[PDB]
Design a protein around this ligand. Structure first.
Ligand SMILES: Nc1ncnc2c1ncn2[C@@H]1O[C@H](COP(=O)(O)OP(=O)(O)OP(=O)(O)O)[C@@H](O)[C@H]1O
Ligand SMILES: Nc1ncnc2c1ncn2[C@@H]1O[C@H](COP(=O)(O)OP(=O)(O)OP(=O)(O)O)[C@@H](O)[C@H]1O
Ligand SMILES: Nc1ncnc2c1ncn2[C@@H]1O[C@H](COP(=O)(O)OP(=O)(O)O)[C@@H](O)[C@H]1O
Lengths: 356, 350, 101, 298, 139, 219, 154
């Protein structure tokens, strides 16, 4: 037997007598296409199928020539190919899914040693939100966007969260690969949707994480058949200026690669201040050891300076990896606490396998 | 004579039903579908179609007049999530392999210990590792070791070859990743074993054509659902290739995989077991001397040993016998093993 | 300017493409217009780009340009008789070319 | 019914008739249908390679109960390789002649077909025809291009013919270990094709082809001089003694050049000296004699 | 209706405009090389009884080479003048296209043309475009 | 080469359809040049005038240069130490001559496949002479300006055509007195003397080091 | 050519095409598969059409279309006429030799089954008397028209 979409008759039995006949002859059938361009004061819209041809047709009198832009899935007649009511991609709540507005479990002391950039992030974020007085009286426009760049996992996510719980109001994190979509012209609508619905509420913070994917990478040198990252990039630099007459909401980007750099972003009005992160000297390392040991069972008679001396060049993900590995050494035997020599092997296991 | 309303709807629809493709679902009794030629239609959907199983990626039934959704269609016998599950038992448990006991406690503490004794982790609050990489020279012990650990377990096991994830329907790739990880989540904490992951992940190149992007999105969604961080339920994943340097670096970096097990070289110790293992299921006569074959040749694997025993069986059947004499082994040792013997600095290093 | 009938100007740099046999298709298409129209002049500037010397294993991009060059050597002077057609080549580096050219 | 084609009406899309025989388009390459081209005794010298092939092909067919009595399975994979092309077609066409068995030859250059999928679909369509006639042998000719190496996809090494190599390796042993199907692959250059199909799980017989010996070179010479006109007082061994590492085909070239020398004289006779100038014509190599290339290294 | 066999797949015969237009005695100086090709190509075509008597089995093909401007194409024209075959010639770098499979299919189209037709002569000018030694196809 | 409107049944030519092209030079079209006051530049006022004498008077006095018997040049080169006003000068003068600025970066020309710059250069020079007397600025042509006759891997093949297709576009065969080129580098001697001579870029505008009096003016 | 006529949608409980006293409806067309798929018979129905033929139309259409006065007595002069009697003899001869080849052959092992499974529809009498009939009638018409004009014209 088969199914073919059946059900027992108690819900569709009354549906199947005369409602099916009214969904055939009155209800028409339309198709979807893409919109290449447009003309002024007259439609003359050019529409491609990508499978049939490119057609030059007109809209119907059901819609107004207002929201029909380049790149929108619209309804196409079978006979006259006329533009019916366009269709949106996705509805509705795609902003709340990245705007949790929730108190994060990060202590302000979780970043110790490189306090100079944290005070820079204090001045750039907190002071035009709550102390906007010296900016007016002297005569410098306050900056409203800072790029972060440097070695990966240096504390980029840590410092970006350190300002997140600092004011606790409208934190928005954007994944860099989430805007890499499949449809033609998908993120640029979402960038319009994010920017409008964040300007409604005040004291809001938006963070762009991993802008190596969409934030001005290669502008258009490898994608010569799709052109989506560039159109979104051209749209976001378009909507950032012009549509920001003296706003309040701050936008921050971070990258690993110090190459994906737009000079049009460093035009004054988009991005002005350079803040990079560097490696800890001695103490910022040892602080992270003091962070990733207090949560686990270690010996109270061991030191952390000696371990950081064995690690000249190291990041917090590496330091976290040593503690997990030295964690596993204590599990290899029947030890319910951590001894110093398990940390010493984990240094030699992590470093002296591939690094140096 | 009683069944009437179902019979009318069996007769209400059009007879030449075509087969469609769900793309997006809008809950206003109409949506957008796809034909077989990639032509897409703003059509509607009926009421009897049982709107509970409509997923973007499912197959439906369409018409010729208005091409509306006649009824939802099943998977049409597509066993791409059920066949890869090992139902029976694999090969011998731990006595099959030999001379790899350096590497046994690694995988035993990583798989069996988080399941059988999850108390060592809770005495100090330390998380178990998620992924384990098995690389080394090709055909060394990698497939033989994975079957050795999967035999000694008390949970379900998955066998994935890697080429049975790659299709061309533009959704089938990352969907079956979600369909497998849903099966692994809903069922017992299975052991994901995806062999040959170098075919899907290397060096992260993006082209403009539509032959390569179906790999990268499936790779990217795999790293997304591996690190979905919502509810994984301790699913242990074992990944293995031969080479390691031409692989994806962000799968190597911690947070993802913290176990990179290497499978080094041999010796004339581990061989003698594999000679005995391969010469067990045959009519081994009482006139054969394997010890002369062991000491003489000094570089061979078990796949070489297997090729010896098969050629020994063939030479015995060419001379119309049942049992095998030593001479068939001697010629098989001299015939088959002469295909790769090249390159040695002899008499130079004591 | 004077005594002109049909004067083609080839830049000899734009005749390469990303597809493997397309440059040879351009050359024969250039010469059939030259047989369509009687007396005609083909001016190819800068033979140094597409000319050059044959050599050994040579980074497969270069194998195409040698195949483009071998097409040019055959079509303008080969099995068929090029009649009422004159060719003006002009460059600056005649040092290393194909001596068959 | 599996792989059952049907007649469909083109107006209402209704069934019309169950169709006859299964999917086998382009069997013009298949089923060679002409049995005599060459005998057995016209090869000579390579009798070991002959006896191996005869009792790796005809012995699994004519007496399968012997192989079903020991306990091991029967071989199906044969690889032939010899760099100058010595006994690479003659030995194929001879076993194609006295076998009374179906012969299918497919060169490894035809499956490429223009656009996608079509070159892949006829792979399985061949084997279902090959299983349709269980007494059959598929011959592969020059598996060197399709079957080289799995390269990257974004750079060169386009993954289009790769699917066929995936299909070929996963059809014969991916689903079911079939029977009465023997494959023969013949190419040189055994360092550049892929090694996954070279494991002993698939191919059991890597029969090489060495250059012929002086007894072998004498026997090849007696083959081609059999139809010519020979004059008395001639030694054929010394001709083969003047071939230091010949290639079998060069015996034909000496026979043609000695024939061509006697042609221009309008003479049906041939001397020993005619062959001496014939071998010296063919022996034209870049490793020149000089007596100093090979004596400084003694 | 049924079309006649091989009404397609190329049209590459030389009959009646165009012609090579050179006599055989125009080349002065190749007393061996003109005599060598003629033994290999024209002489099998007419005097076939002489080969069969000795058992020579005339050669299948011929490689010509050397520096440019020694008389290479000029010889092939005077061959094509004094012949009674369907002379089928082809540029070397011709049958390489953008779409894969086109090249080898055009190879089949030429050979099925000449084999089904008269005892014809196939001439390829250059092959160093398409016939060097092979190595690992990295590209 | 025209994209005419065609009836779907009669196949009749009735429309013109103004014929767009690739999106890459569309991305290179930069309009709305902000008016930068020349007094922002300190110490380099001679070079400002010599530029204004070179371009603006050919834009204004079109008939003064025709009755005299001369031809205005179309090639101007800026060079010097990087950061001395190579990107502060002509885009301050593109703001008053309303003639549709059109940038051209150097390494954007280098693409992955072969024969991409030869399309991309020519189409850029196509669109400008399709337009009004526009201005083509090229920035860092040191990248594509090699030092020729050198066949050494890997920069031996992909550059020289795009170099040439530039060069044969500048003077070339037909006269190109429709669009002006103000192309600039920061390096001189690495260039080969191929387009480096007159005909092309001949107005050598050196940028000196800013003086103490120039730097104090700028601050 | 076909004409049609719409039936109302109110006759859903009664069978359409209310035929009463007629039996010509099985004639003139039956509804084919390409017709009964779109609207037949549930929307519209087919109708029969005959042709109003009469005198004062039919004979005068034939006498002005298929009629020739001066052409019925021409001679089609013998440059190409006896030339046409030569290209046909050769192909008839080869068919006769092929007809010779089969008649002398005479397979006499299971003849009636070998004859019925091996037909050619061109050898025995298909290509043998077809052209022979055509060459016979043509020269008879030509010579008789040649003899009559010699009787008439002096
Ligand atoms: N033992 C032999 N006796 C007679 N002739 C031989 C012998 N070995 C080789 N030849 C000659 O060598 C020629 C090559 O045929 P062979 O099958 O040996 O290689 P091949 O198949 O042509 O090589 P490839 O596979 O590269 O095409 C044949 O013409 C054959 O006459
Ligand atoms: N022996 C000769 N007698 C008369 N003319 C000759 C002779 N040798 C060469 N030539 C002239 O030189 C030219 C030789 O060119 P040909 O077309 O034979 O090819 P090629 O130049 O020798 O070879 P390629 O074209 O491959 O370099 C001919 O056009 C011919 O006019
Ligand atoms: N004469 C000048 N007066 C004031 N600022 C200048 C001058 N020359 C250069 N600059 C400054 O230099 C900066 C950019 O240098 P630029 O000329 O763009 O370097 P390059 O063109 O070599 O990349 C601009 O912000 C501009 O303020």
């Amino acid at each position: 037997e088969s199914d073919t979409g059946l059900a027992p008759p108690a819900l569709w039995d009354l549906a199947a007598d005369k409602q099916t006949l009214q969904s055939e002859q009155p209800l028409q059938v339309a198709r979807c296409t893409k919109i290449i361009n447009a003309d002024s004061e007259d439609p003359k819209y050019i529409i491609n199928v990508k499978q049939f041809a490119k057609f030059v047709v007109d809209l119907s009198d059901q819609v107004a020539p207002t929201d029909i832009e380049e790149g929108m899935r619209v309804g196409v007649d079978r006979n006259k190919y006329q533009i019916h009511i366009p269709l949106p991609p996705k509805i509705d709540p795609t902003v709340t899914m990245m705007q949790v507005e929730e108190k994060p479990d990060v202590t302000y002391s979780d970043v110790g040693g490189c306090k100079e950039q944290i005070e820079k992030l204090r001045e750039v974020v907190e002071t035009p939100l709550l102390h906007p007085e010296r900016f007016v009286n002297l005569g410098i426009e306050p900056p409203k966007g800072v790029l972060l760049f440097g070695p990966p996992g240096t504390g980029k996510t840590l410092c970006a969260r350190a300002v997140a719980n600092r004011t606790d109001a409208c934190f928005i994190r954007v994944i860099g690969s989430e805007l890499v979509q499949k449809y033609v012209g998908e993120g640029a609508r979402m960038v319009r949707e994010l920017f409008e619905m964040a300007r409604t509420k005040k004291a809001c913070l938006i963070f762009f994480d991993e802008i190596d994917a969409i934030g001005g990478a290669r502008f258009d040198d490898g994608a010569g058949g799709d052109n989506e990252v560039q159109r979104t990039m051209l749209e976001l630099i378009n909507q950032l200026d012009g549509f920001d007459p003296r706003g309040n909401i701050k936008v921050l980007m971070a990258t690993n690669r110090p190459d994906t750099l737009d000079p049009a972003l460093m035009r004054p009005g988009r991005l002005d201040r350079k803040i990079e992160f560097s490696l800890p000297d001695l103490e910022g390392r040892t602080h992270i050891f003091k962070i990733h040991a207090r949560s686990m069972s270690v010996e109270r008679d061991i030191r952390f300076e000696l371990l950081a001396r064995l690690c000249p060049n190291s990041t917090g993900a590496e330091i976290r990896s040593v503690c997990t590995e030295a964690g596993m050494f204590a599990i290899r035997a029947r030890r319910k606490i951590a001894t110093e020599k398990d940390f010493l092997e984990a240094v030699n296991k992590v470093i002296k396998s591939y690094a140096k | 004579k009683q069944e009437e309303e179902r019979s009318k709807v069996d007769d209400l629809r059009g007879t030449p039903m075509s087969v469609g493709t769900l793309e997006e679902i809008i809950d206003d009794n109409h949506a957008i579908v796809s034909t077989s030629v990639g032509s897409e239609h703003y059509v509607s959907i009926l009421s009897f179609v049982d709107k509970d199983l409509l997923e973007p990626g499912c197959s439906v039934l369409l018409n010729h007049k208005v091409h509306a959704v006649i009824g939802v269609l099943m998977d049409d016998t597509d066993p791409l999530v059920t066949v890869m599950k090992v139902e029976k038992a694999p090969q011998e448990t731990y006595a099959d392999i030999g001379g790899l006991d350096n590497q046994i406690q690694e995988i035993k503490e990583s798989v069996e210990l988080p399941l059988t004794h999850p108390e060592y982790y809770e005495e100090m609050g330390i998380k178990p590792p998620k992924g384990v990489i098995l690389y080394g020279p090709p055909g060394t012990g990698k497939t033989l070791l994975a079957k050795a650990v999967a035999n000694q377990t008390s949970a379900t096991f998955l066998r994935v070859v890697g080429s049975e994830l790659i299709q061309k329907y533009l959704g089938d790739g990352p969907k079956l990743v979600r369909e497998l990880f849903r099966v692994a989540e809903e069922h017992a904490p299975s052991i994901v074993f995806i062999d040959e992951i170098d075919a899907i992940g290397t060096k992260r190149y993006d082209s403009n054509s539509g032959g390569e992007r179906e790999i990268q999105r499936t790779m990217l969604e795999l790293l997304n659902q591996l690190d979905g961080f919502d509810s994984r339920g301790d699913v242990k994943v074992i990944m293995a290739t031969n080479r390691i340097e031409t692989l994806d670096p962000a799968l190597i970096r911690p947070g993802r995989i913290d176990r990179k097990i290497e499978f080094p070289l041999p010796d004339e110790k581990t061989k003698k077991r594999i000679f005995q293992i391969h010469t067990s299921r045959m009519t081994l006569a009482d006139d054969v001397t394997l010890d002369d074959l062991i000491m003489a040749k000094d570089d061979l694997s078990g796949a070489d040993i297997k090729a010896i025993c098969t050629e020994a069986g063939l030479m015995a059947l060419r001379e119309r016998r049942m049992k095998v004499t030593n001479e068939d082994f001697k010629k098989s040792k001299e015939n088959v093993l002469y295909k790769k013997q090249e390159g040695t600095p002899e008499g130079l290093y004591l | 300017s004077q005594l002109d009938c049909n004067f083609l100007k080839v830049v000899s740099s734009s005749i390469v493409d990303k597809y493997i046999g397309e440059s040879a298709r351009l050359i024969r298409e250039m010469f059939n217009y030259a047989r369509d129209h009687q007396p005609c002049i083909i001016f190819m500037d800068e033979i140094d780009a597409i000319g050059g010397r044959r050599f050994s294993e040579g980074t497969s991009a270069d194998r195409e340009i040698q195949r483009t060059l071998m097409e040019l050597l055959n079509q303008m002077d080969g099995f068929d008789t090029l009649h009422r057609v004159k060719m003006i080549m002009a460059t600056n580096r005649p040092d290393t070319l194909d001596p068959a050219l | 019914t599996p792989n059952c084609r049907v007649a469909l009406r083109n107006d209402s899309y209704t069934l019309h008739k169950i169709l006859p025989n299964k999917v086998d388009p382009l069997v013009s390459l298949m089923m060679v249908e002409k049995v005599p081209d060459s005998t057995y005794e016209m090869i000579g010298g390579l009798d070991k390679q002959i006896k191996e092939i005869k009792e790796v092909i005809e012995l699994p067919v004519k007496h399968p109960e012997l192989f079903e009595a020991l306990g091991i399975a029967q071989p199906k994979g044969v690889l032939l390789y010899g760099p100058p092309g010595t006994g690479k077609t003659l030995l194929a066409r001879a076993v194609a002649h006295h076998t009374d068995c179906t012969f299918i030859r497919v060169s490894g250059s035809e499956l490429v077909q223009k656009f996608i999928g079509e070159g892949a679909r006829m792979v399985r369509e061949l084997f279902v025809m090959a299983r349709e006639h269980a007494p059959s042998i598929i011959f592969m000719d020059e598996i060197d291009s399709i079957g080289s190496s799995r390269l990257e996809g974004g750079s060169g090494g386009d993954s289009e013919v790769q699917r066929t190599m995936l299909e070929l390796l996963n059809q014969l042993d991916g689903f079911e270990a079939t029977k009465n199907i023997k494959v023969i692959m013949a190419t040189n250059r055994i360092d550049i094709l892929d090694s996954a199909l070279l494991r002993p799980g698939r191919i059991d017989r890597k029969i090489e082809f060495p250059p012929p010996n002086e007894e072998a070179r004498l026997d090849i010479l007696k083959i081609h001089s059999r139809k010519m006109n020979l004059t008395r007082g001639i030694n054929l061994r010394k001709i083969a003694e003047l071939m230091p590492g010949a290639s079998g085909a060069e015996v034909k070239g000496v026979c043609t050049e000695a024939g061509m020398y006697a042609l221009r004289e309008r003479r049906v006779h041939v001397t020993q000296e005619d062959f001496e100038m014939a071998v010296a014509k063919v022996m034209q190599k870049d490793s020149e004699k000089n007596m100093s290339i090979k004596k400084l290294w003694k | 209706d049924v079309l006649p066999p091989e009404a397609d797949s190329s049209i590459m015969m030389l009959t009646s405009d165009q012609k090579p237009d050179v006599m055989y005695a125009d080349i002065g100086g190749m007393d061996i090389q003109k005599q060598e090709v003629r033994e290999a190509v024209e002489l099998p075509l007419t005097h076939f009884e002489l080969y069969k008597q000795i058992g020579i089995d005339p050669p299948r093909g011929v490689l010509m080479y050397g520096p440019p401007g020694c008389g290479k194409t000029m010889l092939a024209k005077a061959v094509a003048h004094h012949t009674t075959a369907a002379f089928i010639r082809v540029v070397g770098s011709e049958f390489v296209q953008k779409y894969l499979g086109e090249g080898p299919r055009m190879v089949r189209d030429v050979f099925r043309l000449a084999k089904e037709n008269a005892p014809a002569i196939i001439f390829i000018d250059e092959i160093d475009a398409i016939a060097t030694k092979r190595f690992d196809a990295q590209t | 080469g025209d994209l005419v409107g065609v009836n779907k049944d009669s196949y009749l030519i009735l429309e013109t359809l103004p014929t767009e092209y690739d999106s890459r030079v569309k991305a290179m079209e930069v309009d709305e040049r902000p008016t930068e006051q020349y007094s922002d530049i300190g110490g380099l006022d001679k070079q400002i005038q010599e530029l204004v004498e070179a371009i603006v008077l050919p834009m204004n006095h079109k008939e003064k240069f025709e009755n005299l018997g001369i031809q205005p040049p179309k090639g101007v080169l800026m060079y010097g130490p990087p950061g001395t006003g190579k990107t502060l000068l002509a885009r301050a003068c593109a703001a008053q001559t309303k003639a549709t600025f059109l940038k051209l970066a150097g390494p954007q020309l280098v693409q992955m496949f072969i024969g991409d710059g030869a399309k991309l250069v020519r189409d850029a020079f196509a669109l400008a002479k399709e337009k009004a007397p526009s201005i083509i600025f090229i920035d860092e042509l040191d990248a594509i300006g090699t030092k020729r006759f050198d066949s050494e891997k890997a920069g031996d093949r992909e550059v020289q055509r795009t170099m040439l297709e530039l060069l044969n576009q500048l003077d070339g065969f037909q006269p190109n007195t429709q669009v002006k080129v103000i192309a600039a580098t920061n390096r001189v001697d690495i260039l080969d003397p191929a387009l480096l001579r007159s005909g092309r870029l001949d107005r050598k505008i050196e940028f000196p080091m800013p003086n103490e009096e120039a730097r104090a003016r700028i601050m | 050519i076909d004409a049609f006529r719409l039936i109302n949608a109110n006759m859903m409980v009664l069978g359409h095409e209310p035929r009463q006293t007629t039996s010509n409806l099985g004639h003139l067309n039956k509804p084919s598969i390409q017709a009964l798929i779109h609207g037949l018979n549930r929307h519209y129905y087919s109708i029969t059409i005959n042709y109003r033929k009469n005198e004062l139309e039919q004979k005068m259409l034939l006498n002005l279309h298929k009629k020739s006065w001066m052409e019925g007595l021409t001679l089609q002069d013998y440059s190409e006429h006896c030339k046409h009697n030569e290209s046909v003899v050769k192909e008839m001869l080869e068919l006769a030799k092929n007809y010779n080849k089969a008649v002398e052959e005479e397979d006499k092992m299971t003849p009636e089954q070998l004859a019925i499974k091996n037909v050619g529809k061109q050898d025995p009498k298909r290509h043998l008397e077809e052209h022979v009939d055509v060459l016979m009638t043509s020269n008879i018409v030509q010579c008789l028209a040649a003899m009559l004009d010699t009787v008439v014209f002096k």
